[PDB]
Amino acid sequence: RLIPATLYPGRVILSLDFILFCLRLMHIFTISKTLGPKIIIVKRMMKDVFFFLFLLAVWVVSFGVAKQAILIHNERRVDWLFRGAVYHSYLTIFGQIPGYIDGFPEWLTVLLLCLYLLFTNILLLNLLIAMFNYTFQQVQEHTDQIWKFQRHDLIEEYHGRPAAPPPFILLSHLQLFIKRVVLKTPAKRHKQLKNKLEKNEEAALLSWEIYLKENYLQNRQFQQKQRPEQKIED
Amino acid sequence: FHSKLQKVLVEDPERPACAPAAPRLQMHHVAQVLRELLGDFTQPLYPRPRHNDRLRLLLPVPHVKLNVQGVSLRSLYKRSSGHVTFTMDPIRDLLIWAIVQNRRELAGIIWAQSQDCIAAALACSKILKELSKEEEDTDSSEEMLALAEEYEHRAIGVFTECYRKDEERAQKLLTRVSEAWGKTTCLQLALEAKDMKFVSHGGIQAFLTKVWWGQLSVDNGLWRVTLCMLAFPLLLTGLISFREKRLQDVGTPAARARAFFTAPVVVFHLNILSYFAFLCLFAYVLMVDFQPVPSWCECAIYLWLFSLVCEEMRQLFYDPDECGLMKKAALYFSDFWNKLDVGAILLFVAGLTCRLIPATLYPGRVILSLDFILFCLRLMHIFTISKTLGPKIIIVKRMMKDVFFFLFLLAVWVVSFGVAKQAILIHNERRVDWLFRGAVYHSYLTIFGQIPGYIDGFPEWLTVLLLCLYLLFTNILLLNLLIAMFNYTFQQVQEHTDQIWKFQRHDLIEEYHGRPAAPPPFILLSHLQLFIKRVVLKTPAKRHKQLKNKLEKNEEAALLSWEIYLKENYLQNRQFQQKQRPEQKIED
Amino acid sequence: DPIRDLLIWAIVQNRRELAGIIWAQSQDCIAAALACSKILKELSKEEEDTDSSEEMLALAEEYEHRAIGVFTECYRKDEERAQKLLTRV
């Protein structure tokens, strides 16, 4: 961007950053109760994204090479023969089909288009649905507990931090340095979830906790006897 | 088994085959029938040759001086042989005799005192499974199959107990040969018994994924090994995790790369990349190099076809029977993927005849395009490798015939709409072999998006009505119910498919291990390396590069004692669980 | 922490039956159960013997459930003090 002789490469190398930062935005957006535990599913599928990309894109090339073979295409320019040969194959999958150019071998054009679409839109779509759904069911409890788990990681970083907006956070960045201009040791404050308790109240909570432990132990001992396998042994 | 034994005695009767006589049963006959029940493995448990050829002792055959189809080393000929002391597997002899009679309660007691434990259990499973498929009585066949699966679980338990403690010696025990069971190995013996559950258990696939990835590691990534695949200098860098690097045994970069290349994984990737690039090479000679003459970039295809087809004769000469040339090709014929490979070869033969003839270039431009996808099917056949790919490509293996089924369903249903679409509207676009276009080819395009609305649309209400009705029938019923019948079948046999993929994992490993690490471009050199060798040599005794490890006796004894100890440990645990089961305590 | 001293010594030796008896007389209950779970989980990942590692992991999960039960019994009655007990050092 600073070099004036490479603006065009700077117009194409900084566009990917817009989605690379969108990935980071999605990383922060593991928050909602109906969002996070099912974004753990895409966390499970992060490598399978590359896997299915390598599968489906190669299978798409398998049709793109075959599409332009029999028909006599003549549209070619520097870095646009590539367009007319390959770029027009992925568009014919999601709808941009130049039929007046794509269609003697009309029977074979029908046959191959039906066969490749049968292989893709059936097998790689609905079996993909099945292998998504079964994996979703398999570790749904695991993912729920995992999201419950990482809930605290966001809380820890968002609690021990000043409430200043990011535009003003540069002020708080220098607030800790002007403080250390006078101070010399790291003893400013402990703003963590670590609460020290007075002894006269700690004793009161601990006695209550012991009482409830014994209550729980009696209940567990009762359930162990109530279990029918124990009575068979009896 | 008694019927089979009374039938072998007549197939080799007294006069013509066991020439002196054979109305008496003797151990050679039962060895012969056990060989039939087992696979094509080595000489059976009892002595075949002239020393103890037990076929022809009822007539006064000569004594020790004979040593041909008679008694040679044994003491006396008293209408018997003598004391063949214990034939080195006395417990296994009772185990086989009890197994062939389907005495379930009796065989379990005898197997407890066995020596070569896992091998005996697997061999019994194979014999039972083979006898069940031939038993005419359904009750006997079902009981035999159930006992075979019981002995499967019995073997799996012992191997699990052995693998938990010192898995490194567990794999050694796995790959060890067994003199007491026909000079075979436990792993190989599992393949023929077909053994869904044993081969899918833990350490089995661990040893598979250890022999695969030959010497490097099991930890570093597939996406990271491919970088040093292409970048030769990057291999010597501190990026890959070797075992030679772990042991700092790198005294020669040539040897460090030699082990890397002899690892089966890079051979697989190198073959895959050659097959991927020669497809691009074939695509090169159809867009720009459409010439009626063999050009500069054309003889490479003929040489490549010559190189690839030689792998078939290499496989034929790999491990055949020394008498059956046609009986080995039956396996290749039954292999429908091999049938597709040879069909793709035949289609190339049919297309080359049109390519060489200058008067049929246009038919050669349309008959060789299908080969590009026919070879893509073969590429997909080889791409049953990844852990998230193979066990769910077993689903499309299940659905291979249903692909044709749903094609015949949906295409006919598409024609049902294509015929009706052009009926009411007055279409007038027609040319030779383009009236077909304008009538039928424009119907499938209107399904996936190419709808010429300005031509397709008085009967606008009926055009709306029929388009809504047909699309309701297709995109709802044949789509989401298809989803349901895919998902339910995926759930139904998911475990079956997982174990099946675990099963076929070894088939790739066997073909990719016993093969030189040369790239396919250089494999023509190794093709003639075995012929220049046979110019000097005369007998097939070059080497045995199989997963069959012979063991020294002083170490075999050490493993077998440990295996017996662990068998007894496992038996005590199983006996304890049987008592712990509540149904047993109710009986108590 | 005399009871906690026996609890740690019994936990590190994988004496499942012995540690449960000692934990019943413990004072800082949930903290002790969680600490025992962490020690067992850390020792399992380093134990070379697979049987010992599996038993240690199973005991760690057992002590997990033991802590969860006590905390549930504490949270049912006066959840406001239950969180105070949770966040106490």
Swiss-Prot record, chain B:
Q: In which tissues is it expressed?
A: Highly expressed in brain and peripheral blood cells, such as neutrophils. Also detected in bone marrow, spleen, heart, liver and lung. Isoform 2 is found in neutrophil granulocytes.
Q: How is it modified after translation?
A: Phosphorylation of TRPM2 at Thr-209 by protein kinase C (PKC) counteracts the effect of cytosolic Ca(2+) and elevates the temperature threshold.
Q: Where is this motif: Selectivity filter?
A: 448-451
Which stretches of the chain are intramembrane according to UniProt? Answer: 222-238, 440-454, 518-536
**Superkingdom of the source species:** Eukaryota
Query: Where is the protein localized?
Result: Cell membrane; Perikaryon; Cell projection; Cytoplasmic vesicle
Q: What is the effect of changing K387A?
A: Decreases in sensitivity to PIP2
| Substitution effect: G453A | No change in the reversal potential. No change in the ion selectivity to Ca(2+) over Na(+)
* Effect annotated for changing Q450 to A/E/N: Increases the permeability of Ca(2+) over Na(+)
Q: Which residues bind Ca(2+)?
A: E312, Q315, N338, E511
Q: Ranges in the Cytoplasmic compartment? A: 239-264, 318-336, 387-398, 483-517
Q: Which residues form a coiled coil?
A: none
Q: Which residues carry this modification: Phosphothreonine?
A: T209
Q: Tell me the residue ranges located in the Extracellular compartment per UniProt.
A: 286-296, 358-365, 420-439
Domain remark from Swiss-Prot or TrEMBL: Contains two binding sites for ADP-ribose, one in the N-terminal part of the channel and the other in the C-terminal nudix hydrolase domain. Both sites seem to have a role in channel opening, but the interaction of ADP-ribose with the N-terminal site is absolutely required for channel activation.
Q: How does it assemble?
A: Homotetramer. Isoform 1 can interact with isoform 3. This interaction decreases Ca(2+) influx through isoform 1 and suppresses susceptibility to oxidative stress-induced cell death.
Q: Which family does it belong to?
A: Belongs to the transient receptor (TC 1.A.4) family. LTrpC subfamily. TRPM2 sub-subfamily.
Protein name according to UniProt? Transient receptor potential cation channel subfamily M member 2
| Species in which this protein is naturally found | Homo sapiens
